[PDB]
Subunit: 171 residues, 2 copies
């Protein structure tokens, strides 16, 4: 993972967010500041906000990170593949966690049913919410979720995904 990729990982509210491009920022809904009128110094009327369950996307009118190129945002992580949760700790330490992704479905997070995807850690803390789930496709990195939750057991984590509707079916 290149430094640029990590530079997209940004402290935000009670957790983290991720610059997908110069104008697009994704994060986990429950970490988003609630009493505010600006994000990153931009008034809400300047920002297109799409929230689906625990997945929140901001598109700013202004180029917030013109140093960045856009990258692909997938609708969920590829089931069965190893992704990395790009965790930054408060000391500055980089803690990428490898995770084997499982099924996409509805899960109860923060007392609400939301589209999510479980994964097995190959640990995280509450402050890690918003950290991106990414994987490499070709020579490029792709982002597919943002950290939402974990079992007390610790071994399983859940990311919120942009669109999970009907990804797994009863047989």
């Amino acid at each position: 993972a290149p430094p640029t990729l990590w530079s997209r990982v940004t402290k935000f509210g009670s957790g983290w967010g991720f610059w997908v491009s110069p104008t697009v920022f994704i994060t986990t809904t429950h970490v988003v500041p609630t009493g505010v009128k600006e994000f990153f110094g931009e008034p809400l009327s300047s920002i297109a906000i799409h929230q689906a369950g625990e997945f929140t996307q901001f598109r700013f009118s202004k180029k917030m990170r013109p140093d960045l190129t856009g990258m692909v945002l997938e609708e969920g992580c590829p089931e069965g593949t190893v992704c990395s949760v790009l965790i930054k700790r408060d000391s500055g330490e980089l803690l990428p966690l490898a995770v084997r992704m499982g099924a996409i479905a509805s899960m109860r997070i923060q007392g609400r049913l939301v589209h999510g995807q479980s994964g097995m850690l190959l640990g995280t803390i509450p402050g890690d919410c918003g950290a991106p789930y990414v994987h490499k496709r070709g020579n490029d990195w792709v982002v597919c979720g943002v950290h939402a939750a974990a079992t007390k057991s610790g071994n399983t984590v859940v990311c919120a995904v942009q669109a999970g509707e009907g990804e797994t079916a009863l047989e």
Copy 2:
């Protein structure tokens, strides 16, 4: 070509930045250091070993602060005529590595403050106010080393000065 953990050493500090040289050693430039405080990174000042002169400030903490890190060598000044990189972090999160050819070491007074400084020329944007403390580094073999911290810049834009930790081989005849 600087790896992510090398960037992870660059840390927001006071009105600028600092750099973890090792799990216990943090360097920065003096004028950006917060004043009238009782601790840094949760550690009481009284527990910190401090070596500070000519705008170069070094802290050694009494416990491991960044145990995830390997210890790097801190050189006394950059190698003259060689090309180093300033690892600039901007508040936006942007990384701006700047190539710079290092030149003369000299003691000097810039805006009233004594600087044990080394001039360099940017090879080409540039540095800006708020960048002080950013590390100057280069490679010795397969290892990275750090040789100074960003202190000042010339109006012409293209020359910068880092504070270095050098002995009195920088005082005029």
